[PDB]
């Protein structure tokens, strides 16, 4: 039930977000085999919910009355996200008690494998008594059936806004994806080495070859959006951070890593693998449902921000000295902001697609599979949504400032024709 210090050596680094560090199990305890632990970080940037947050998530009491942030995250996924996405592809993760010594031991144990800039920003919140055990989807099913290749995509937002509330100078937000605009700021802030080739509009397009174009793009410039695992081990993409362009060195390493799984002449494993991922993505149409959650951002931050200030009962700084939104009932305003924060979740979650050579000996042969015509292989696949985090209400402020920043910088750069 409780993870003590000694257990620390059994977990190895897997990756990290901005708010969570993730370790994969390595020991042999039946409880944790094929599981990962998601540990919340203590940001120096920043009870379980603010006074305003209880007001918003009011319709969902199991949420507002949570003991810790771990159960809060659990109940959010379970009570808000599942009903929207389906329980087939989402698991909320079992909670577990952890000791302060365990956490402190883990933090120091992994410090060396972490990106420096990540360490600068946060460590594990050693005040928490809890943590989350999820399944290790770099392993196919629970408990085996031969090697497993899995891909983790962070697709980000795949639609263009359409809001009335987009200002006059900012109307370029209508044409260009937020992702592409944001790339110019990251590159400006020395957050990435070169602009990524990826355009989420291709991935979400519902078009077969635009999906392939996206997967190819992802492979070329993975940054923080593309990872590939072999039996849990990272074989492509950055570890808890963005990575540089796929060089011929990296490309080759990955090309080697795929031996046997994709059954093709040496050198052609990579392009066939990409085809496979593209086919599963498109076939499953699992993106369509996600994009729907995303499109719950009906009004865009420039619209929704006005509602936020009505929620937190403060004079809206964004209107100086719109009738439309500020005349809405409190009820309607809460809906808008809630759904914005849900969309937010959806825009930052990641997909895991686990592959495995079709096992003819299954008790119930899977519904979902991809036939690889050229290599004569059939692969079974599963899709799962991960990193489904509740976004904190106060963030509404920083969302607006950030967006304003992106769109001004993009306009600024364009004005140099
Ligand atoms: O720290 P990074 O890996 O560069 O990614 C951050 C981070 O996403 P993670 O959840 O993956 O860390 C932010 O979330 P927090 O961890 O700070 O909660 C998220 O912001 P929101 O999820 O609040 O939108 C932001 O995404 P965005 O840039 O869309 O705000 C995103 O940055 P990138 O995904 O652009 O790298
Ligand atoms: Zn306003």
Task: Summarize this structure briefly.
The chain has helices at 51-56, 61-64, 69-85, 100-110, 116-121, 178-188, 200-203, 208-220, 248-257, 269-284, 286-294, 300-311, 323-326, 330-348, 395-414; strands at 2-3, 11-16, 20-25, 35-43, 94-98, 122-124, 130-135, 149-153, 226-230, 233-236, 350-357, 369-372, 377-386.
Number of DSSP-assigned strands: 13
Question: Biggest sheet: strands, sense, closure?
Answer: 7 strands, mixed
Residue share in helices? 25-40%
Helices, by number, come to 15
Question: Could you outline the blueprint of secondary structure elements for this entry?
Answer:
Blueprint: E1 2-3, E2 11-16, E3 20-25, E4 35-43, H1 51-56, H2 61-64, H3 69-85, E5 94-98, H4 100-110, H5 116-121, E6 122-124, E7 130-135, E8 149-153, H6 178-188, H7 200-203, H8 208-220, E9 226-230, E10 233-236, H9 248-257, H10 269-284, H11 286-294, H12 300-311, H13 323-326, H14 330-348, E11 350-357, E12 369-372, E13 377-386, H15 395-414
This protein binds inositol hexakisphosphate and zinc ion.
PDB class: transferase
Keywords: transferase, IPK, insp5 2-K, phytic acid synthase
Assembly: monomeric
Relevant terms:
417 residues, alpha+beta, Phosphorylase Kinase, domain 1, seven-stranded mixed beta sheet, 39% helix, binds inositol hexakisphosphate, binds zinc ion, metal-binding, metal ion binding, inositol-1,4,5,6-tetrakisphosphate 2-kinase activity
Write up what this structure looks like.
The protein has two domains: 1-146, Inositol-pentakisphosphate 2-kinase, N-lobe (Phosphorylase Kinase, domain 1, 2-Layer Sandwich); 147-417, no CATH class. 39% of the residues lie in helices and 18% in strands. The protein is built from 15 helices and 13 strands. The strands form two sheets. Strands 1, 2, 3, 4, 5, 6 and 7 form a seven-stranded mixed sheet that branches. It has a six-stranded antiparallel sheet with strand order 10-9-8-11-13-12. Strand 2 and strand 3 (20-25) form a beta hairpin. 38% of the residues are buried. Belongs to the IPK1 type 2 family.
């Amino acid at each position: 039930m409780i993870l003590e210090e000694k257990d620390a050596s059994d977990w190895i680094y897997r990756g990290e977000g901005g708010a969570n560090l993730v370790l994969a199990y390595a020991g042999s305890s039946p409880l944790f085999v094929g599981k990962v632990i998601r540990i919340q970080k203590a940001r120096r940037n920043d009870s379980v919910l603010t006074s305003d947050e209880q007001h918003l998530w009011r319709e969902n009491n199991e949420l507002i009355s949570s003991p810790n942030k771990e159960v809060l995250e659990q109940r959010y996924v379970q009570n808000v996200i599942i009903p929207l996405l389906g329980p087939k592809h989402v698991d909320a993760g079992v909670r577990v008690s952890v000791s302060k010594e365990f956490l402190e031991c883990v933090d120091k144990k992994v410090t060396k494998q972490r990106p420096l800039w990540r360490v600068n920003a946060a460590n594990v919140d050693t005040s928490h008594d809890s943590a989350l055990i999820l399944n290790d989807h770099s392993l196919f099913s629970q408990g085996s059936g031969g090697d497993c290749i899995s891909v983790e995509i962070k697709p980000k937002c795949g639609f263009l806004p359409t809001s009335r509330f987009i200002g006059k100078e900012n109307m370029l937000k209508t044409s260009v994806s937020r992702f592409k605009m944001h790339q110019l700021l990251k590159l400006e802030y020395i957050e990435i080495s070169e602009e990524s080739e990826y355009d989420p509009l291709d991935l979400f397009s519902g078009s077969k070859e635009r999906v392939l174009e996206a997967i190819k793009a992802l492979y070329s410039t993975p940054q923080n959006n593309f990872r590939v695992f072999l039996n849990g081990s990272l074989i492509l993409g950055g570890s808890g951070e963005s990575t540089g362009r796929t060089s011929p060195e990296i490309g080759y390493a990955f090309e080697d890593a795929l031996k046997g799984f994709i059954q093709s002449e040496d050198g052609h494993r990579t392009e066939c693998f990409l085809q496979l991922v593209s086919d599963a993505v498109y076939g499953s149409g699992v993106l369509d449902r996600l994009l729907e959650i995303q499109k719950l951002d009906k009004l865009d931050i420039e619209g929704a921000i006005h509602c936020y200030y009505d929620i937190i009962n403060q004079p809206c700084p964004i209107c100086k000295e719109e009738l439309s939104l500020h005349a809405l009932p409190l009820d309607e305003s809460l809906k808008i902001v809630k759904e914005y924060l849900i969309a937010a979740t959806a825009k930052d979650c990641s997909i895991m697609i686990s592959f495995q050579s079709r096992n003819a000996w299954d008790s119930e042969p899977s519904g979902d599979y991809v036939s690889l015509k050229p290599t004569n292989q059939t692969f079974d696949y599963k899709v799962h949504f991960i990193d489904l985090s509740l976004k904190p209400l106060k963030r509404m402020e920083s969302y607006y400032k950030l967006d304003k920043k992106i769109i001004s910088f993009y306009n600024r750069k364009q004005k140099a024709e």
